[PDB]
Amino acid sequence: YNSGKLEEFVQGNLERECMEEKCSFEEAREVFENTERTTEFWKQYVD
């Protein structure tokens, strides 16, 4: 869930971060970065 140590400097993997453990909508919007794409994605991942 992006504790903020040695996982920000990695590439872009929405799974290792968002799927596996935990994650904010914002989190997606850094790798993903298309916040529209990520909100739709968000409506099948939130709740």
How many domains make up the 3D coordinates?
A: 1
Distance between the termini: 16 Å
Oligomer class: monomer
Largest sheet: none
- What is the CATH architecture term? Irregular
- In percent, how helical is the residue content? 40-55%
Q: Tell me the CATH superfamily.
A: Coagulation Factor IX
Identify the overall geometry.
globular
Question: Proportion of β residues?
Answer: under 5%
Order of helices and strands: HHH
- For the record, the CATH class is Few Secondary Structures
Count, helices: 3
Based on DSSP secondary structure assignment, what is the total number of beta strands? 0
Rounded Rg? 10 Å
* Protein structure class: mainly alpha
- In CATH terms, what is the fold-level topology? Coagulation Factor IX
Task: Walk me through the topology.
Blueprint: H1 14-19, H2 25-31, H3 35-42
Helix pairs in contact: 2-3
3D architecture notes:
This protein is mostly helical and 47 residues long. It has one domain (1-47): Irregular (Coagulation Factor IX), CATH 4.10.740.10. Helix content is 45%, strand content 0%. The protein has 3 helices and no strands. Helix 2 (25-31) packs across helix 3 (35-42). The chain starts with 13 loop residues before the first helix and ends in a 5-residue tail after the last helix. Glycans are attached at residue 39. Mg(2+) 1 binds at residues 15, 20. Mg(2+) 2 binds at residues 26, 30. Ca(2+) 7 binds at residue 47. Disulfide bonds join 18-23.
